[PDB]
Structures are given as C-alpha cells and as structure tokens.
Amino acid sequence: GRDLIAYEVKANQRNIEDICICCGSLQVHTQHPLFEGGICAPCKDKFLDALFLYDDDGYQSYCSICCSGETLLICGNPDCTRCYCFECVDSLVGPGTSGKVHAMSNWVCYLCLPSSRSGLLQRRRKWRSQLKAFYDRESENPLEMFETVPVWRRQPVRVLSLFEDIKKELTSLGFLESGSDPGQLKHVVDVTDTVRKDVEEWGPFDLVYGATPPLGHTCDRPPSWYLFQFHRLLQYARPKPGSPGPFFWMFVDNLVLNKEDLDVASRFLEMEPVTIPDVHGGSLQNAVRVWSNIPAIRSRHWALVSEEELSLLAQNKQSSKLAAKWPTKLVKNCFLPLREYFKYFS
Amino acid sequence: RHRKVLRDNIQGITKPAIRRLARRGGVKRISGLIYEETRGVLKVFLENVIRDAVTYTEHAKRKTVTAMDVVYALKRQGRTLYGFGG
Amino acid sequence: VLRDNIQGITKPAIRRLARRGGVKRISGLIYEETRGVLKVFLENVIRDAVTYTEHAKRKTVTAMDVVYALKRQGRTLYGFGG
Amino acid sequence: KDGKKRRKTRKESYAIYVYKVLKQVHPDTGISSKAMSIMNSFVNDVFERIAGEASRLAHYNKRSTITSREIQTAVRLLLPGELAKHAVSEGTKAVTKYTSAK
Amino acid sequence: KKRRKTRKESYAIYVYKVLKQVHPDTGISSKAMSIMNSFVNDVFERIAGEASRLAHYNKRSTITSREIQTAVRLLLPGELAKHAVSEGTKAVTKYTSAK
Amino acid sequence: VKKPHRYRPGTVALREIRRYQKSTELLIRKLPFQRLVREIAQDFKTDLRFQSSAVMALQEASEAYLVALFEDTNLCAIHAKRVTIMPKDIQLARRIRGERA
Amino acid sequence: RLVREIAQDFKTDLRFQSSAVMALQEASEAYLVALFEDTNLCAIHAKRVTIMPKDIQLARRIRGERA
Amino acid sequence: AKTRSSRAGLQFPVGRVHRLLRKGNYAERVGAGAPVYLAAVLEYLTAEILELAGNAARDNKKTRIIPRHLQLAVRNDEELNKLLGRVTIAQGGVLPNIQS
Amino acid sequence: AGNAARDNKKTRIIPRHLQLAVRNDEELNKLLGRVTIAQGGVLPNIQSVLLPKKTESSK
C-alpha cells in the first residue's frame, strides 16, 4: 500500500501526521524527524537504529525515509550525504521519477534544491533541535548532538591535526581545498610547547583530529601521550561556552593502547570505543578503535568482532609489523556523516 | 534492472540440515554455536569454488555456468568430482 | 650397525626441532613416534627419487630427483635447481 | 526411415568398453548410467594423470617421445602398493602380446 | 675448452636488475638467487600449465594474452591478481603501439 | 502418567547416525542452496545463469566437504575428552588442514 | 646413513649427491617443524602443554596421511 | 582388418588412447607401444573396481551397480583409497564407521 | 625482502629475509602455502598460552 498514502492526503483531506509514510501503515506513534508526517512504532525504532549503523558500501546501509535495504541512489551535489529509496520517490512525488533520479549522479537531491516543496514533501526549520528532542524521547541515549550547519550559512573547515597528518585523507574526502593553501589545516608534529595563546593565534578551530602511531612504533613516546595532549588541545580549541558553534573531535587508536589506557581514554572522552574490522582476505586483516562526537559513529562497532581475536591480531601485528602505514583509509570513512557540516571540494 | 538482489539465503541452510550433515559425519552431540560457524565455512567454500567457476565462464565468452566449469573449479582446488564429466 | 641408523636421529635432535616448532614440553613417548613418521616421510620420497633415477638410466640420485619427488607430493622445495 | 533430425556433436565416452569389462568380470551384473558416468570420469581422470606424469617424465630427460617406458614409470609413481606391481605385469604382458602377434 | 661448453639458462641477471630498480644499494646472496630462480620457474610453469588447460578446455590450439590473463586471475589470490592483471595489460598496450 | 514412551539422548542420536551414514541422498534442501549459490554468484558477476547439473554438482561437493569437515571436527571433539563438537573443533580442523588462508 | 639405509631397500648400490641429501634434510626438518606446530596445537586444544603420540596421530589423521 | 585392441588381447581402444595422447599436447612424438601399455593399465584399474563393486552389489542383494557400490568398493580397499584420497564420488555417501 | 633486510641491519638478502618477506604477507603465503624455502626456518610466533603470566593481582 504505497500508492494509497498519496491518495489519503489529496482526496480524503487527511493530515500527513496521521499516516505512516514508511511502510504505508495507518498507525502513527510520533512525528517524523526530517519531514512533516507520522511514523509507526517498529519503523520508528528501526529508523533510529539505521542512522547509528555505518555502511562501507554507501552513505546509508538502509534507506533514510522508509528504511528499505535495496533501491539506493546517490545525491547529485557532492556536498550532501542523503540517500532515499526508489519506492519513497515513486510513492510521494510520482511514478517513473526514481529511475530518472538514479539515472544521473549529478541530480540535486531534495535538501540541496532552493525550494524544498517537491509536491508531497515538507521541510522543517531548525530541524536539528527537534531531531535532538526526537532522540531524547525514545533513543534511550542522549548522544552528542551539535546543531546542523546549513548550506547557505556554511563555513570553511578549520582543522587541527595532532601527531598524524590527514590533509591527503580530507583532500580525498573533500574537506580541504587543493591548489590553494590559505592554511585551513595545521599539522603539528610536536605539541609539548603549544599554549592557549598559540591556538588563539592559529585561528578558531571547528574540527581537531588526532591518531595513534602506526603499527611499526615510529616514535619512542608512550601512546597515551597522543590521547592526553589531544584532550588538552581539544579543550583549548572548544568554543567559548554560550556560543552557537560546532566543535567536532576524533581520537583513533590502531590497537597500540592496552586495556588500562583504553579505559582511561574511554573515561576522559566519556564514551565506549568503536572497534572497526577491515575487509577479510580469508580470516581477518586489521582493526581500529575510534572515539568521536560525530553523528552515527558509536553504532559503527560490529558485535560480531570479538576481543580475544582482536588481542591475537594486535599481538601478531605488533610483533610482526610488516606494514607500517597509518591506516588512513580505515579511519577515512568515519568522517562521512560530517559531510553535511562543512563544505566539500570536488 | 529486472533482477531482485537475493539476500539472507545463508539462513536457508536450516538447523536440521546441519544436524543431518553432522549425523552423516558421525557426530553424537552438537553445541548451539556450531550452526553459525558451519554457515560461515560453507559460505567461504562456495565463495572459493564459485570464484573459480565464474572466471571459467568469463574466459569461455558465455553467460551460463556449466557443470564442466564446476568440475574444473573443483579439480583445480584438488577436489576431483565424478559423475558430471571429468 | 646396519639397523640402528633410525636411532642416529637422537633425542636432542627431535628436542631442537620441537623447540623450533614451538613445543614447550615433550613426553617420553614422542621420540619413538616421530622416528616412525620421519622414516615414512623418507620412504614416500625415496621410492619416487630412486624411480626417476631408474627412468634416467643413471645410478646417482641427483638433487633434481629429490626436487621432482617433492614437487610430485606438493612439497615444492626451492634453492636446489638452476 | 527418419534420420538426422537434430545435429548434435557425438561426445565420446568409454561406456561400452566398461560394459564389456563388467560382462567379462560379472556375467549378470548391470550398472546404472550415473555409475557409468562415474566410471567414465574415472577413466578420463586416471588417463590425464598417467599422461601428464609421462609428459613430465619425458620433459625431465629432454626427450620428445612418450614410449611404454614413460607410461611404466608413471604407473610405478602413481599407483600405490600392489596396484603398480600388477598393472606393470599386465601392461608388459599386453606389449609383449602386441609386438609378437604378426 | 670446446667439449666443456654447456650454458644452463637462469634468471639471475634479470632479478638482479629488478632488485637494483627497487632497492638501489641492497644486494642478494647466491642461495637466495637460486630460490628466486626456482620461484620464477615455479610461477612460470604454473601460469603456462593453467593457460594450457584453459586453452584445451575451449578447444583452442593458441595461447594469447587472454588465457594468461584468466590464468593470473585464477592462480594469484586477492589484490595481487588485480595488480598483476593491471601491470600486464599496461605492458601489452605499451608493447603493441611502440616504435 | 507413564504412558508416552520417551527415548534417551544417546539412542535416537546413534539411530539417526546409522540412518544418515547408510543413505546417499542430499541433506541440504535444494532450493535454499540454489538461492545461496545465486546470492554468492551475484557479487562476482551480474546476470548469471546456472545449469541444473552445475548446481547439483556444487551441492554434492559442498555436502561431501561438510561431512568430511564434521568427521575431523568429531575427532577434535573426542581428543578433548568430549562428545560435544564446538566452534573450537571446526577452527582446529581448518587450521590443521591449512585452510586459514 | 638413515637415507642410505632406507634407499638400500628400493635399489642396491645407489650413489647420492651432497646437494640431494641436503635437500632431503631441508624438506624433512621443515616437515617435522610443521608437524610439531600442529602437534602443539592438538596438545593446547586438550587443555595441556605436553605433546603426546595422540597429538601426532591426530595431526596426521586430519592432514589425511594415515595410509 | 584386425584392430590393435584384439591384437594385444585388450578391451580399451588402442586407437582412441593413441589420438588422445597425440591431441593432448603431451610430447612431440608418441610411441607405438605406449597406448597399448596405457590401455592395459586402464583396463586393469577398471576391472579391479568393477570386481569390488560387483562384490559390494552381491552383498547388497542387487544385480545393478549403483554409485553407493562404487563408493563402498573404493573406500573399503586401502590402495584404491590411497589412489582416490582427494576424489569425491557423487551419489556415494560415506562408510558406516562409528567410533568406539 | 629489501624491507626485511633493512630491518635486520643488512644490505644483502639472505633466504631468511625471503622467508620473513613471503610468510608475513598473507597473499604471498596463500600463493606459496605448499612451498618450502631452503635455509628459511619459521616465523618467530609464540602462542599466548605457553608464556608464564607476567601480571599483578589487582586485589
């Protein structure tokens, strides 16, 4: 029943809030976070879970609006991460349009277009605060929620990379502009003599990234040092309390800190880590723990990944240390939800 | 286009199927975590054999996987199968 | 004299090979067992290695006959054939 | 009479020969087509094994001729135990019969 | 010495030049050189025998770069096969349209 | 009431072991195994097409492989003074075979 | 002397090369080290650390070499 | 017209083995005695398995050899099990062997 | 092998370096699984159950 929900509004003169736009159902628990309308309880529960879940293959593992698995299309403008199913587009705006949308990779999505009224879609003003209230009512966990940054009121990202360079990554990920060096990323190898005055002189920061050494133990400095300095300069770079400004952070560990240091890092960053496994080439390859406040980053950990297998991989990697590249590609993906917060360079 | 992506067919390998394959294997008592591990090992085995057989189909300039390409894919992996043409 | 060359494989030789294999502790019945298995592993090679020497109409078993007898059993050995 | 309706390439086999050998060792026992396909695949498999082993035995000695001696050494390598010790006697008896049948 | 004249071929003078292109100062022993020679002969006979089977399967009495391509896609595991097929295709395309 | 006859956990088990060792039919259901083969084939090539004999050959080879694997798994279970197979036994069997690669 | 005594049975009055006997010793020691690796895994699996002939028989029975 | 099969007292075709040696790109030349010797070896290896399969059929009170009879014929003999150790026979099952 | 030689402070590849080069890589170990390299040895890899517990009781 997907061609009926486009009939209940036009003919019966009913409120969009009184029909579940996901699976076509007539029962409505709450109001939909992104757009005006109602959502049945199972679809509501699953929709929240889908946002948390992170997929390597596409921006969204399951569909945004109705939470379907297949029929995934990509957003035209590369500065947007939204993905919708074919059945939502057909059901709401009209049949035979989903194919047209999927046919090009440069088709401007619903949020990038100047007018957000397509025919059966309504946008929300200052939606992120309402979205935080949505998480507050049922998500049972108040995950770190910074106001969303509009495209019209967008700022150049100011990046502070500590102990590890990400300019290649962010450039590949479209966070840093190539060809022009205004200096929107400062790589700082040594930070022992950094002071609040220095950070204030360096210009205000919006994203501060840090990461542990690669598996070949390049430097002879204890790995907790990277965490503790990352925390310090992080606190320095946080905006003045009582200011509507985004501040994101991410500390990444390639299994170089033991359980003692792991609990210490988890306590200071006030959350449990995120273990990410890499594509199996027969058994298991490598894995990485990540702390961050970036949306849909905590749910990235996969329950299948065991501790003992991880310990064995760590001890086979530490002692062998064949490859010694920082896994930039492993931690490259995790910034993908941040795309809607800063400007993208194609 | 006109091809629905088949999914969750690893659960088509049911619990009594792995039970009967353990009865033929001589196993008297099976633990509860056997079934996920057995699905995973059967999935990796089919990945290896179909990875060979689709490449045999690729070089033959066809779009149909034959029984002879399955026998070649298994005889390459040192598991010679009889009854389908060597 | 012509029977105790299987005991020419000594207890410290099997001790050193099991230390290389990462074995922490060895029981007293390992040494009778391994001398059996190694002996079988020589026969299955030498039965082949003499046979190539039969077909070449030679009397010397060369390194190439050993490399071919191991390659036949899926134990391809490197660094003895040019 | 009807003839040549559907042109199909005659796939060779060993089915009538395995049938002859089975009637020589068991004068009343039949065999299914599935087991006949298994025996056909067995004869193809062991043919490829002994021919490939004889090809390696020919290439190792820098000779470009496969005679009965290369097949004999391939049989002595591939067949374990008494199988080689009887198959070499059967093959040598057959070659002795074939050479002096004129 | 006219009766003492038998030159066995190898791959020493080539693996030495590939080593000097990869590591311009690292050397190699003669035992490791014989191991690299046996490795080149092993992988050569693997890809040649596999391509010969892949020609005989399709009733073709000719080996071209396509049989060697699918033999590399069968014998080499994982990304190693993809990089070897990329390098082989690039070298064949450079070879055909050269001087 | 002691009317409904119930067996021991070591009677019907051995009875079905003797039943399914003397049988030659396929034990995995044909259509879910066929859907699994098609799903695994969709990652390598799109728009494939299987002969029925090819799927039957895959099913014969996969069931024979799993029966041999459960025989080595049963030996690994008995060696640890147990009659219960566990994923440790399957991992040990595929480690000693040399299939952790 | 072990290789010569084992070779006495298949043919009388062999000759060996030094490289052939060294190749046999390289392959035989590598085979035994891999065998004691699987033997040690079989010993660890039975909650022990000491290897036993049961472990060597189990490793060779899972390798499919009991013939 | 006397065929080479009955000239050597064999049953397997000498000519078909001869042209399959010449077709398979094994060597440049193929000897005259080699297909005779190989047909004799294949005939002995066929006759032994058909003898054991006929004995397994007679034990099962059947006059047709099913693939279960070839399975029991190959797996019970230890030299044929060593020959076909890495070979799966379809429609075969396994041996009724229960651990003590 | 040049990386394994540079780790071992040597400017000449010995068969130990080829052994460590092939066996540490997973795709080369899959390629050369049933292959013995002469004068190689094995990987220095000790299991985590045969070591004595070098830990301290928290209580």
Ligand SMILES: [Zn+2]
């Ligand atoms: Zn719904």
Ligand SMILES: [Zn+2]
């Ligand atoms: Zn967009």
Ligand SMILES: [Zn+2]
């Ligand atoms: Zn949707």
